[model samples]
Structures are given as structure tokens and as C-alpha cells.
Target: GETLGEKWKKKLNQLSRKEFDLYKKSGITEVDRTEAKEGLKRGETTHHAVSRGSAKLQWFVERNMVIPEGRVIDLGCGRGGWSYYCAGLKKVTEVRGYTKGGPGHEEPVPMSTYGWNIVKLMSGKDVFYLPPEKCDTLLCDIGESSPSPTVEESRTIRVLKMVEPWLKNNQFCIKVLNPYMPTVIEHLERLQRKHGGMLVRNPLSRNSTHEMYWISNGTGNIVSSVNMVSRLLLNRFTMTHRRPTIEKDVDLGAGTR
Candidate 1:
């Protein structure tokens, strides 16, 4: 239990009813509430949480050079886990969670219930801006599922375009699934070509089918190295699983042997 991995394993071994109550009060929807409860009940430890969180943290620190100071934004933040952790553990000045919609969607809520500071995106419109005097980091945890192919790409481009202006002197941390990684890389390249910036990929310990992209302005070479590392790490962990099928009831009448 000396190392982080050991500590994480130890933490996963126990849970208190009070923790469950706190989770319920954290403004998460019933579904996530239930899932969190189940996870905790089944002995999901703090170590597991910290291992995943720490892996991302390590990537951020190694690539960005500093545990992001100033304001930090968590886009598509679900249940405010990372946001809360960043604010509390890392002592970030401010942490904001943004989502397309509200609760029941994949967006995270406030961290007050968990005794942390995480501002929701809806609180103010100016929160997205990232001037040198404002926020320094933007973290996007959006997913990659759409009804139509073209619309999905267009939508992603639109969002990234909207956020581009705010990335000056700041860093952009994005989490995307494997299926959409190509599109995201294309978008980043286009953005860099048109407006200068760099893109890096960060592999998470818990990421089986996803990778995180860290983009920053005026750090292209460093970002590229990090991106290469991420690609290698992702290749090491990527796996393919066969879809499972179940057969319904079958009749074997007249087969009495």
C-alpha cells in the first residue's frame, strides 16, 4: 500500500454508507446515482478512482509542464469526478464543468455535495473565454455517437471551432473514443494549419476504448511527442472483443433416443 497502485487497491476495499449518501446528494441523476451506488457497493475502491485519475494527471503534468493553474474547464464532465478531484487534490484555482445539456445527460453536476468546488457551465457565459488573464485549461470529455455520419463530424467541428478562440495561451484536453479519433485528429490538424496550435494524445489507465487529446497553443513539438507516446500506449492496450449472442428456447420433440 506504499505505492499509488497499492493505495488505490486498499481504498477500493472499503466503503461507507455516508459516502453513498454523499454521492446521492451530488446532484447526479438517478441512473448515475444508482451506478455509483452499485460500484461502491461492489467494492469499487478509491484506489481504482485515483489510478485512473492519476494516470490522466500524469499525462497532463508531463505534457503541460505544470498542474494547470488558473481556471480549468471540464467539458462534457459527467458527475464531476475529475473536476472535483482536480479542484480538491490539485488545488486548482477554479474548476468548471460544461455539458451540452443538463442532468440525465452525460454532463457532470456541482461538487458541493462531495465537499469540492466545481462550477457548472450554465452559471455564466464568460466562463468559456481563455485570455491570458482568464482560464488556462479546457478539458473536453465528449463522446462519439451519432445518428448520422456527416452531422457528427460537422457537429464536432462546430464545437471545436467555437472553442478555438478561447484557447490562446491555454491548453485543451479532450477525451474521445477510438471510432472518432481520426476525425478529431483531422480537425486538430486543420485547426493547427489554419491557426497555430499543437495536439497531444494521452492514454488513460482505465481507457480501454478511448484516448485523450491535449492541444495547446505555441507548443507543437512537445505536443507531437506526447501524441506519439499516447499512440504507443493506446496500441498496447487496445483490444477487440467478439459480440455475444444468446439463443432462445429450442424444442427437441420426437428426438427420444
Candidate 2:
């Protein structure tokens, strides 16, 4: 739970419900109202809820260092934190966020503060929905724990493939679970072969061992053909080193049949 701004984290976590209510009463921002609603407000003081907000904010600040410059497409824009920060960055020109539903997406995203857009997808819906436009960075945070390894791998690859063509010359940052990191790396290697970019693995604050940000750079034309082959060989060699040796279960009495 290491983060840069401890003072700010304390400030946010210690925010009073009364203050939250008053903020809602003023009708300044929409999210306050949603969070102030009975259930949400009641949960505010509970163990995990208080810390989760600032904990993530701190990590995002560190993550900002590597955030690619240019237009950004944020899928699963939970509370719109990453989108908001990206929009505020000097290098980013435009940012559009896609969310299915949340208290955050209920009210209009304040466009005046930052150049951004938020689109709420239908609940049962998936995103074939985003407008087809090339962007600088494509961000998708596979929120929380994934269902199963096989499903997670397939799902991650599917999303990457679907959006792979849209990345013109920037990066794709995907936050995924730890068990799936190797699978993601292997898939990105294949992508590196096709699109020609570098891959970076970043550790997030929570469960550093089990979660990571898999980033693939897509600076087209710069990666020479020779460099690509060398990089490919290097990655393959590393993967081979990590590959687990499989052995068949043998009965002691039967020996090596």
C-alpha cells in the first residue's frame, strides 16, 4: 500500500459523511450524491472502503510516469480515475472512457475541467461499441480477480486482438491478474511479432505479486526488422527458461513403464 502522497490519502479517507451530504446538497458534482446515498455512505467507514480509494490514487500517480502521450481510450472506466488523470496530462490531447454503469457514470462527467468523454455501455453489452478510431494509448483494467485462468487468457487475448489494429503508434496498458501474466506475455510476444513494439510489465500497488500492468508499445516503423527478430528470440529464450517441466505421474511399484 505504498503511494506518493500520504497527506492527500489521509484527507480523502477521513472525509466526513456530513461533509459529503452537504456536498451533495449543494449539487456541485453528481458522484457525491451517489456516494452519499444510504448504502454507500454507510459503507464509507467500513474497513476496506476507506483505504481503497486513496491507495489506488497513490498507485495511479506512480503509473502516470509511464502513461503514453496522446489520445486515450479507457475501457472499464470504473470511477474514471485513470481517464481523468490521463486527460489532465500535458501529452494527452483527447480521452474517451467506456463504462457499463456505476455511480461515477450516472452523472455527466465534468467536461470543463478536462477534455474527456464518458460513454455508458448497456449492462449485458460488450464493446464493439466504441467508435473505430486510432489512438495513442488503449487502457483496459481487468478489474478484480478473474474467473478462471483459461477464460481470463482467452478473454484478454480477444480484447487485445480486437483493439490491436486500432493502436497506430503509442501503447496498450492492460492491468491484469498475476496468474495470467505469463499468458499475457506470450500473447503480447505474438503481437510484437505482428505489430512490432516493446512490452513492459509493471507492478501495481495491491498484491504486487498477483497483479500487473502489461504495456505494449506500438511505435510503428521504428523497430527495425533485425531488432524485431532479436527481440523475439530474446523473449522466446526467457519464456523457455520460465516454462515449467511437465512430468507424468508414475506408480512406484510399476516403475518406469
Candidate 3:
């Protein structure tokens, strides 16, 4: 009857009994993207958890490098690690933690050391329920990046479309997945391009480290430092499905997603 992060030392910094109890039920695992950066793997139970957390938090640190005092929506808000870290550690003040319930939820309650607001969507719920105000930054760790070939794009469209409710002009959506997915990257580019948006990888990133991507109307070059992450991120793994494809290429096909 264990849940994710069940053994983390600071897990108590932001968790409840329901969260502990929920872990047992979390055996119903779903695949999400991650770990393909540093372009390696060394997984055990907790190491995998630490890996995902470290990458996302690192990216957020980087995101804050550019925009401090952010309001984040942990769109997939798994376990609330990112949400809690943002509220408890980072300068992010307003965090909307949306999910379908979890063993990993941390900010479902009302405790923000920074005096922040972390609103959680109730069980059987998600981001779509929100009113769609100016939610500028969104993080979807597993969704769109999630392992399920279908769920990835499906979730991507779901989150991006919400930008319509309230545009995040020059906003950022950061994701952390173990392995990079090429066609997914293409789809992301197509999505961003369609919106007149641009893609960004951290300027300080390496070929094997910091495999994160962000989108914004802001002016940042299409990172040349790590030609590998881009060339690799947008260009490999699922060659057969791509067909170098798009109506898809143009429409980005997410609307139907």
C-alpha cells in the first residue's frame, strides 16, 4: 500500500494521509515522457522519481532564470512535486495544481510558506474546469510527454487549447520526460509555429543534460548551443510514423486530439 514519494525525507514538507494512502492505488501506472536526456538511464524505484523531479525543478529554476514570480499550472500535477516545490521553495506565488488525484499530491491543502495559492482540481478532474484566465506558465511532466503514444499529443492539445480561454502571450510550457520523442517534438514545433510561437531550450543546457523545451512569443533564438537536443529532440526515435509528416505539419492535428 505504498505511494510515490512515500519514502522521501522532505515528503512531509507537503503531504497528507490521503496522499500516503493514495500511493497504494497508484499502481495503476501510466507512461509519461522523461529520462532521455543526459541521454541515459539508471532506474530503480526512487531513483526514477528523483530523476523526474530533479529535471523539472531544474527547468523551473531555469524558467525562473528568465521570468521570476511566475504563476504555474502543474497541468498534469503528478504528485505535486513541482507544485509544492514552487510554493514551498521557489518564488512562484500562484500555482494551480490540477490532477485526477494521486499518491504524489503535495499541495492539495492550504500551506504555502511563501504565502502562495495552490488550488487543486478535485478527484476525477483536471485543468479544463478552470476559467482560463491569464495562466502564463504551464508544466505537463507526463502529459504529451507521457509514454502513451496517444495520450501525449492528446494532452498537449488539451493544455495548449486552454491558452485560448486566456492567452499566455509569450508564455512557457516546460516538460520533463526520460526519453526524447521526435515526432512529438515536430508536433510541438508545429503547434508553436501555428500560434506564431517559438521554441526554446535552455541556453545552459548540454547534449546529455537539461533536455527541456519551452515555448513563448518572447524573442530567444532556436538554441544553437545544443544542436543535439534539437536535432535529437525534434528528429529521432519514431522515424516510421513521421513520414516527415503534417497536414499535421500545418494544422498540427491537435484540435482533433
Candidate 4:
């Protein structure tokens, strides 16, 4: 019988070489999904380009937020690294990655699977379906920085609303592009105002493009709010996040992670 580690390493071999190399050099510990044990399948464009596992994993480490025995729901789980790092290495109870499911889609990471609710996410059609149970946390990968967030204004708005109702208690984290960081900030504000949630973005990740966030519905969670005026000023600034050691990194420019 194949051991679980054996089952996992085999899956890692399915990733693209570039994706593999990122994990290979990460030295991810405690919960080591791509921490030198496996590689991702290549050019898998069915999913958008998001943080693999390196930086985000390190962020969790620095922040002391890794949930060693918690359940997570990875919404729009582009790379599945959000789940893998926490669940795979840290001993999180489980991370169920949810995607819009497509023809060429396989589980993006070793333990992740296709999204459960089968409603059309894009195609711009109005599709609403009641989803299943929520988990201890939610990770939504808002995707790469390009074409401007102005690319599809309504889509991102709809995207937020699409996932809003299902948050159980709105324990969520979002990784988004920031070409138009101001615009992204506004949308999150509206969500916070309406749903009684707290929204905070990672200043360190804001470059010419990438933006990151942690949100909550102001319930049992310690929901904190920053004045939008203060945030707008802050967006004008930047912060530094530690990255995993990379073997060879192409200058994808400011927000390349």
C-alpha cells in the first residue's frame, strides 16, 4: 500500500516545472506540502496565477495564524497552496478547496478537490445556488494583477457578492491584484459596512498590482476596521513580507509573488 506521503509526492510531480521549483526551495516546515516534497503541474491556466505557497506560508508563520487543527474552505482556490500549507503541514483539520470546476480541472493540489456547489461562477450569468457548510476559515484567491481591476468591474463586485452569502460567519481571507488598489478598497468597504464585517488589507503585498486581505463578520472574531481615508493614505505606502529562498527568480516586477 502506498503511504500518504508517497501518495502526496506523486501528486506533486504533476505540477509545472516553475511551480515545482518554487515549492522545492521553500523549506516549508511543520506542514510541508510543497516544502521540497513535490512539484505542481505546468501552465495550468485554468486557474489564475496566485501565490503558490512560499510567501503566504511565511506570512502565516510570522503572524502566528497557522491553524494546526482547524477546518478551512479555500474559495476560488487557484493554486490550492492556501489549503496545502495549513492543512498539509500544520495539521489543520481539513481544507476543502472550492473552484468553478472545468473540463481540464483536476485537484490543483494533492488533497484538494473540485468545488462542491455546481453553479457557473463566470460566464456573467446570474447563477445562485445555496452552498454546503462553511468552515473555520475561508481563503478566496482573487488572482493576478493585470488588465487592470477595471477589466471587469461588475465581475469582481459580483464575485464578492457571489461568495458573501455563503461565508457562514464571514471568516475569510482574500488575495487580489491591485492595479487599481483604490477601487478594490472601496468594494471591501461596502462589504464591511453592509455585512458588519471587519476588513484589513496587507500593505506589504500592495505593489503596482497585488493586494491581500483578512476579513471577518465582526462576531466572535476580533473584527477591526481602519478608516478608509487612513487606508487610502496607507495604500500610498508599502510594507515588506519575507519570501522563501528562491533558486532562480525572474523579475516578475513588484508584485511577482
Models 1 onward score TM values of 0.51, 0.49, 0.45, 0.49
Residue-by-residue lDDT tens digits, candidate 2, 1-257: 21122222233234476633332223111122233234335543111111122223324434552454667777765555556555545666776666666443332232222333322222322455655567777877644444344455566566666666666656666654422334555666677677564433332132111334445633332223223432332333222122222222111110110
lDDT of 1: 0.44
Give residue 109's error in model 3 in angstroms: 7.9
User: For each candidate, what is the lDDT?
Assistant: 0.44, 0.43, 0.41, 0.42
Task: Report the lDDT tens digits of candidate 1 across residue range 47-149.
Answer: 2221133235444555553355567876655555556545543445677665555444543343232324344444222223533234767666554544343
lDDT of 3 by residue, 7-27 (tens): 121242233665434432222
Candidate 1 lDDT score at position 185? 56
Better structure of 1 and 4 per TM-score: 1
Q: Which stretches of candidate 3 lie above 4 Å from their native place?
A: 1-55, 63-71, 88-91, 102-123, 142-151, 176-212, 217-227, 230-257
lDDT of 3: 0.41
Maximum-lDDT candidate: 1
State the weakest 10-residue window (summed lDDT) of model 1.
248-257
Please give, for residues 9-95, the per-residue lDDT of candidate 4 as tens digits. Answer: 344445467654444333222222342232224433222212434345435434544332356666665445455444433335555
Preferred candidate (lDDT higher): 2 or 3: 2
